[PDB]
Amino acid sequence: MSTLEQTIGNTPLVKLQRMGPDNGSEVWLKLEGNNPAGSVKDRAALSMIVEAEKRGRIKPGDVLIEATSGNTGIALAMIAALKGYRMKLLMPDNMSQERRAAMRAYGAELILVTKEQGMEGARDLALEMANRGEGKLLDQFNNPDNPKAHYTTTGPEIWQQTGGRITHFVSSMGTTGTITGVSEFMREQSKPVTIVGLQPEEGSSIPGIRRWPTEYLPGIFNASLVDEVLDIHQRDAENTMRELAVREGIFCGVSSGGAVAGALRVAKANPDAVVVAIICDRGDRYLSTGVFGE
Amino acid sequence: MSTLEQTIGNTPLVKLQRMGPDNGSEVWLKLEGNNPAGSVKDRAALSMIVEAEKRGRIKPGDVLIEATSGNTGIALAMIAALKGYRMKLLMPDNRRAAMRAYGAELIEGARDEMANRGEGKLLDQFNNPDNPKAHYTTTGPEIWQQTGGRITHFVSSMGTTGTITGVSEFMREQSKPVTIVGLQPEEGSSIPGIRRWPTEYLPGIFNASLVDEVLDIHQRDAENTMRELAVREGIFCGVSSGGAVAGALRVAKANPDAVVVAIICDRGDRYLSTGVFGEEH
Numbered sequence: 001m002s003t004l005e006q007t008i009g010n011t012p013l014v015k016l017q018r019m020g021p022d023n024g025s026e027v028w029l030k031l032e033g034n035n036p037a038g039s040v041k042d043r044a045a046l047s048m049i050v051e052a053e054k055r056g057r058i059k060p061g062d063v064l065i066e067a068t069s070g071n072t073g074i075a076l077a078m079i080a081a082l083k084g085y086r087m088k089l090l091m092p093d094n095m096s097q098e099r100r101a102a103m104r105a106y107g108a109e110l111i112l113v114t115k116e117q118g119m120e121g122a123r124d125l126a127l128e129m130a131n132r133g134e135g136k137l138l139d140q141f142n143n144p145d146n147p148k149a150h151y152t153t154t155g156p157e158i159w160q161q162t163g164g165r166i167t168h169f170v171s172s173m174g175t176t177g178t179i180t181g182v183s184e185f186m187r188e189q190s191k192p193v194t195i196v197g198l199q200p201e202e203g204s205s206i207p208g209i210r211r212w213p214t215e216y217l218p219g220i221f222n223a224s225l226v227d228e229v230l231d232i233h234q235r236d237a238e239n240t241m242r243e244l245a246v247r248e249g250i251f252c253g254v255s256s257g258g259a260v261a262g263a264l265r266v267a268k269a270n271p272d273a274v275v276v277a278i279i280c281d282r283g284d285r286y287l288s289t290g291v292f293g294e
Numbered sequence: 295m296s297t298l299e300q301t302i303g304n305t306p307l308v309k310l311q312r313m314g315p316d317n318g319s320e321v322w323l324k325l326e327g328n329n330p331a332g333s334v335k336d337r338a339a340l341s342m343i344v345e346a347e348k349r350g351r352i353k354p355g356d357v358l359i360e361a362t363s364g365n366t367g368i369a370l371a372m373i374a375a376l377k378g379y380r381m382k383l384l385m386p387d388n389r390r391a392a393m394r395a396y397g398a399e400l401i402e403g404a405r406d407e408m409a410n411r412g413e414g415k416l417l418d419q420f421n422n423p424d425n426p427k428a429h430y431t432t433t434g435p436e437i438w439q440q441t442g443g444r445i446t447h448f449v450s451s452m453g454t455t456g457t458i459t460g461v462s463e464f465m466r467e468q469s470k471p472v473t474i475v476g477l478q479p480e481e482g483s484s485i486p487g488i489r490r491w492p493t494e495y496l497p498g499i500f501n502a503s504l505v506d507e508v509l510d511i512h513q514r515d516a517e518n519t520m521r522e523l524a525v526r527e528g529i530f531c532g533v534s535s536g537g538a539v540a541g542a543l544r545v546a547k548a549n550p551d552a553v554v555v556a557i558i559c560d561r562g563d564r565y566l567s568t569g570v571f572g573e574e575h
């Protein structure tokens with residue numbers, strides 16, 4: 001039997017037991033939590049490191065550098081352990097300690113920056129380090145190796161678990177590799193599939209995703225892939241997520257109970273509606289932050 | 295169409311790539327963290343409840359009881375919502391908000407409100423035979439399959455003890471010898487999910503005929519190994535699971551060309567705030 005890395009992907013697709021409207025419009029869950037490192041990110045991290053062991057770029061024994069909100073942090077830490085890389089991650093210091101700790105536990109080098117510096121500052125600091133000789137920068141935000149994972153794996157999966165049937169795909173936007181990569185695959189399907197994407201409102205802190213300031217716009221984005229972009233409230237992200245285990249037994253991050261929000265908006269909108277919503281990790285690395293009770 | 299229930303079970307079997315004796319043996323771990331609740335107790339929980347319908351005893355609206363505080367509280371709670379059951383759970387110590395998230399409730403002289411007939415039918419995981427049934431029905435066939443029937447030693451960290459019993463249950467009926475070893479703390483070792491009764495037990499579901507040896511693990515080796523599984527193998531798990539692989543390693547050490555499999559009951563994510571993934575010496 002099988003290797004941890006071949007335990008990444010082929011994730012379950014589960015329809016909403018009870019929640020939301022019912023007007024013929026069905027909603028199915030992409031369960032990325034199940035990934036060995038517990039998030040959607042593992043697909044991209046694998047892709048990224050093995051695609052670049054392939055173009056001869058990186059090689060075991062090497063140090064790798066990434067700036068993270070955590071998940072990709074925890075992701076590349078894992079795979080590295082599996083293949084004998086050393087990792088440093090760059091993260092801001094307002095993210096949770098469960099995020100801190102899982103990255104450390106996998107034996108990666110963790111560097112925290114100010115929250116006032118936040119994600120864009122950790123990117124800036126990432127670039128410098130590498131261009132000073134402190135390691136190789138894989139750059140999930142501009143690496144087309146990240147959306148390739150979804151476009152290769154995620155996308156073809158969603159289609160065959162809905163057969164040839166999905167009408168909508170709702171995705172929470174961070175890196176944007178998921179939406180973009182899943183969008184590539186679907187464009188080619190000789191039927192129409194509407195890819196919807198979600199961003200925090202004005203002042204809406206939700207971990208996993210961002211509306212990226214202008215000069216930090218992910219190179220991998222591609223507006224022609226994204227039909228609509230929806231705006232998601234931080235409280236309606238925590239409200240639906242909590243609604244989701246209580247009412248569905250699906251135990252998820254806020255990013256996920258958010259994407260179900262939009263997904264429900266779509267269904268609540270379109271009847272006849274097969275709407276696959278991305279759930280990114282689980283509820284556990286959010287537990288100690290008071291979001292799931294206190 | 296699929297559901298969470300069918301996402302319970304058929305977990306990944308994972309071979310150690312660089313920890314163990316270099317003498318012939320192959321240690322393979324069974325990734326029970328994968329369960330939709332992220333622990334082994336999803337299998338029993340669903341069974342326990344599901345089989346309490348094959349024999350009609352509970353209604354999707356019925357009040358279920360169990361005084362647990364951890365993973366069982368999580369899976370049980372987990373499955374009730376799946377099926378529309380009203381679960382109520384009781385107490386640990388004096389940390390685990392992962393229960394009420396699933397919609398549960400806060401709270402004899404074992405120790406350890408109120409009682410069965412009082413308010414709802416308690417599940418009695420420590421006696422309920424549908425505990426090892428799960429392993430007998432699933433966790434046994436799976437490992438048997440995945441290993442090409444090549445498994446020589448089963449290893450398990452022992453709480454409600456159902457896991458080893460059922461898998462031994464299934465194991466015994468196979469046409470080859472399959473030794474079965476349960477893991478227990480040394481009596482002052484504090485390891486979550488496994489305790490050294492009698493502290494007056496054995497659990498009801500236990501079967502000395504089904505075990506083949508019992509090694510004692512200290513707290514220091516469990517925490518240490520779980521430490522090593524993370525950095526050295528990319529395996530991030532809780533402290534009993536750390537104990538499992540250390541037991542498998544002593545077995546492997548004794549039994550050269552062996553094929554050993556140990557259950558990883560859960561991923562280490564609920565453990566991080568304990569700080570148990572900081573090293574010590």
Ligand SMILES: *Cc1c(COP(=O)(O)O)cnc(C)c1O
Pocket residue numbers: 039041069071072172173174175176177178179207208209253255280281
């Ligand atoms: C990064 C991340 C996302 C975003 O997916 P991207 O492909 O980066 O757009 C969503 N949720 C979580 C928890 C994430 O970590």
Ligand SMILES: *Cc1c(COP(=O)(O)O)cnc(C)c1O
Pocket residue numbers: 333334335365366451452453454455456457458486487488532534535559560
């Ligand atoms: C369930 C559990 C055990 C024990 O397994 P049992 O089948 O109950 O003997 C050990 N450790 C942890 C973390 C568990 O959850």
